[PDB]
Design an enzyme around this catalytic site. Structure first.
Site, PDB file in Angstrom:
ATOM      1  N   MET A 130      29.645  53.037  34.350  1.00 45.68           N
ATOM      2  CA  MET A 130      29.419  52.052  33.301  1.00 45.68           C
ATOM      3  C   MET A 130      28.502  50.973  33.856  1.00 45.68           C
ATOM      4  SD  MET A 130      30.593  53.013  30.577  1.00 45.68           S
ATOM      5  CE  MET A 130      31.581  54.417  30.069  1.00 45.68           C
ATOM      6  N   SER A 183      43.694  40.586  30.559  1.00 47.63           N
ATOM      7  CA  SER A 183      44.769  40.149  31.472  1.00 47.63           C
ATOM      8  C   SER A 183      45.233  38.737  31.222  1.00 47.63           C
ATOM      9  CB  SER A 183      44.286  40.135  32.914  1.00 47.63           C
ATOM     10  OG  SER A 183      43.232  41.058  33.085  1.00 47.63           O
ATOM     11  N   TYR A 240      36.503  38.461  38.593  1.00 49.33           N
ATOM     12  CA  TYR A 240      37.311  39.237  37.659  1.00 49.33           C
ATOM     13  C   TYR A 240      37.648  38.408  36.427  1.00 49.33           C
ATOM     14  CZ  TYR A 240      41.318  41.899  35.852  1.00 49.33           C
ATOM     15  OH  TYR A 240      42.194  42.596  35.056  1.00 49.33           O
ATOM     16  N   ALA A 288      36.322  35.545  35.321  1.00 46.86           N
ATOM     17  CA  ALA A 288      35.145  35.157  34.570  1.00 46.86           C
ATOM     18  C   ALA A 288      34.832  36.255  33.575  1.00 46.86           C
ATOM     19  CB  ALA A 288      33.969  34.921  35.500  1.00 46.86           C
ATOM     20  N   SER A 289      34.840  37.499  34.035  1.00 46.01           N
ATOM     21  CA  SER A 289      34.498  38.589  33.131  1.00 46.01           C
ATOM     22  C   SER A 289      35.546  38.808  32.036  1.00 46.01           C
ATOM     23  CB  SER A 289      34.252  39.880  33.905  1.00 46.01           C
ATOM     24  OG  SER A 289      35.474  40.511  34.239  1.00 46.01           O
ATOM     25  N   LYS A 290      36.817  38.594  32.352  1.00 43.80           N
ATOM     26  CA  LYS A 290      37.855  38.855  31.357  1.00 43.80           C
ATOM     27  C   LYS A 290      37.860  37.779  30.299  1.00 43.80           C
ATOM     28  CE  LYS A 290      39.733  42.767  32.587  1.00 43.80           C
ATOM     29  NZ  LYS A 290      39.883  43.914  31.663  1.00 43.80           N
ATOM     30  N   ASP A 338      52.229  48.458  37.122  1.00 44.76           N
ATOM     31  CA  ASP A 338      52.450  49.222  38.348  1.00 44.76           C
ATOM     32  C   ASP A 338      51.503  50.400  38.517  1.00 44.76           C
ATOM     33  OD1 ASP A 338      55.599  50.804  37.247  1.00 44.76           O
ATOM     34  OD2 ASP A 338      53.508  51.088  36.611  1.00 44.76           O
ATOM     35  N   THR A 348      46.227  51.240  41.778  1.00 45.13           N
ATOM     36  CA  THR A 348      45.362  50.167  42.259  1.00 45.13           C
ATOM     37  C   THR A 348      46.053  48.815  42.394  1.00 45.13           C
ATOM     38  OG1 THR A 348      43.489  51.250  41.172  1.00 45.13           O
ATOM     39  CG2 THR A 348      43.157  49.026  42.010  1.00 45.13           C
TER      40      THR A 348
END
Ligand code: NAP
Ligand code: NAP
Ligand code: D3E
Ligand code: D3E
EC number: 1.1.1.146
Lengths: 262, 259
Positions: free
Chosen positions: B73, B150, B163, B165-167, B199, B202
């Site tokens: 992607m 999230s 992370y 910032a993007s979410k 869970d 990763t």
């Protein structure tokens, strides 16, 4: 650690400061207020013609010194040398004001991916690059970062999707960085500025006939105060309806609750 | 506008569905649930190996159909072609689940601008590209977009800047897009999913000894249920304190203020 007092001009006296998108609007005003305090200031944008005036007029208003460097924040290389060149010009740096954005109109998002990328590059990424570049200097002077965001970066509106994506990013990114500075006992304050509608040429051009904006001059000022007084967030919106609700305890709670957790 | 009635596996049967980052973790689980339900599915990620395993397992769980297309992607041309190929493999599309993210870890941020840039490219920008490419079909079928986010996309944690910032970006962009569909009267719902610690291989790997995670299979189902009921937001966490704490009405109110 927000300061336990209120603000008076002297705090900016002889303080070396950078202002971006300072050729017009809120940026310019901030520059002017800054001179009225006798601070050192370097300003940037793309057009040199308008920058020349801002510089020239800041001297009148009494800036210890005032210079400009022109270049597009579309360009991470420029953003990186800008900070080096300016800070060495002033032999240091006390406050970084990240204010510029790419040109945006109001419309439906319509498959304009290129404009979403550009928004994200100019409005968000460049701020990081700019911060990276100043961190060493800001550590030196236990300085401050001020990041100009919007309402549209705390809650949703139509007609500014790209713009909003990028403004939301600043919050996520810089609020995250604060917690990191805290726990690394890094003493650089970071101020996020949630601004309602402001009476700038550009903003008024797009609105006005869709109606009301708060005065640009004061906006510039409040931004400057929040930054000097090392406050986490500053709100400046004409309607006092808004200013009281935006706050958000669930987050402050959820953040702090998961802090003493590890 | 959310349907005002409980959901039933019967809602997804014959529904043609794309799931991204579906090779492992929450995405795999989502593909499995959709297969148990008899949907058609196209899954994607970089590793063809793991994808085959998923597909094959989906055909055994009862999927009406199940194909895969590997790609990164990180490459916007691939993203755009994926959706086309998938549209054809299923003759249309009812739901689009944007779930993939770029590899990350928990670490202080010094000057990893290329990681910030990659996060924004992969976790955010590709979603837009995907969305733009799928929107026509989705229009045709009064379908749904499901974006997986999230807590770190609603509040700030240290160690996940890029992370977050993007979410956050996804929230701003999609919530704003939601408004635009409403004033354009486009009948395609958008569901933003706010997840707590889950869970997955990763996640558990990454927070091994620094921090209770919810079951990824139940999570996977919530996400789908939220999508099919056309909910604006889904909240899923082990702590019910948390799930209920996150909703943000002071915000929904504000938004209505200027509306
Ligand atoms: N005014 C509002 O209604 C409003 C509301 C909420 C938040 N804000 C925030 O306040 C800040 C300033 O708003 P404003 O209305 O004062 O803006 P503005 O007056 O229209 O000025 C924009 C500034 O950014 C510069 N700029 C444009 N493209 C650039 C590029 N590629 N690289 C470097 N500089 C570039 C412009 O100079 P050049 O064209 O010469 O490059 C100009 O100096 C922005 O961060 C905005 O998000 C504004
Ligand atoms: N698990 C959690 O605790 C948690 C918490 C909050 C939110 N979330 C959200 O839930 C979603 C999935 O999380 P997860 O834990 O299930 O993730 P995961 O198990 O690690 O799976 C990530 C998926 O994305 C794919 N991917 C990675 N890089 C890619 C790339 N460059 N191009 C295309 N695909 C790529 C991976 O496959 P390949 O490597 O083969 O490409 C994998 O299929 C994410 O949006 C995450 O942010 C998770
Ligand atoms: C760059 C620009 O001047 C601009 C962009 C965003 C904002 C901004 O932050 N907003 C204020 C803080 C909320 C917008 C105000 C108008 C809102 C709007 C426009 C059209 C329809 N409905 C709402 C969108 C948010 C202000 C000016 C624009 F868009 F060109 F006018
Ligand atoms: C991709 C990854 O697996 C991951 C990233 C972010 C989240 C995530 O969204 N979080 C939950 C939703 C909040 C993280 C949980 C731990 C948080 C944290 C880290 C360190 C210290 N205190 C809290 C950071 C966000 C979960 C897994 C990672 F980062 F590799 F671990």
């Amino acid at each position: 650690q927000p300061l336990n007092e209120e603000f008076r001009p002297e705090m900016l006296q002889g303080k070396k400061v950078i202002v971006t998108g300072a050729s017009k609007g809120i940026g310019r005003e901030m520059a002017y207020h800054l001179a009225k305090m006798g601070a050192h200031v370097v300003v940037t944008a793309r057009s040199k013609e308008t920058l020349q005036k801002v510089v020239s007029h800041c001297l009148e208003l009494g800036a210890a010194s005032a210079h400009y460097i022109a270049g597009t924040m579309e360009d991470m290389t420029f953003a990186e040398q800008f900070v080096a060149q300016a800070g060495k010009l002033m032999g240091g740096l006390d406050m970084l004001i990240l204010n510029h954005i790419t040109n945006t109109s109001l419309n439906l998002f319509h498959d304009d991916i290129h404009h979403v990328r550009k928004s994200m590059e100019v409005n968000f990424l460049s701020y990081v690059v700019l911060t990276v570049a100043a961190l060493p200097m800001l550590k030196q002077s236990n300085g401050s970062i001020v990041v100009v965001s919007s309402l549209a970066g705390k809650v949703a509106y139509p007609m500014v999707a790209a713009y909003s994506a990028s403004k939301f990013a600043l919050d996520g990114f810089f609020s995250s960085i604060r917690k990191e500075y805290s726990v690394s006992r890094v003493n650089v304050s970071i101020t996020l500025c949630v601004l309602g509608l402001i009476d700038t040429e550009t903003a008024m051009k797009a609105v006005s006939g869709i109606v009301q904006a708060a005065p640009k001059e004061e906006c510039a000022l409040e931004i400057i105060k929040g930054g000097a007084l090392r406050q986490e967030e500053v709100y400046y919106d004409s309607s006092l309806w808004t200013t009281l609700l935006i706050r958000n305890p669930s987050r402050k709670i959820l953040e702090f609750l998961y802090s003493t957790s590890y």
